[PDB]
């Protein structure tokens, strides 16, 4: 229903949320925000939970 995304970059930091019908379709939308901000890192997520994080 509601997911979360943390930005543990070097300078840019913050959190956000997204509503998707699947962790897969959701991850696709997460690759837009960061990218649009030039944020690149490792994407990790656990089915049990719904928290995403990106480290540069």
Curated annotation (Swiss-Prot):
Organism of provenance: Streptococcus sp. group G
Subcellular locations according to the entry: Secreted, Cell wall
Name of the protein in its database record: Immunoglobulin G-binding protein G
Residues of the full protein shown: 444 to 497 of 593
Gene name linked to the record: spg
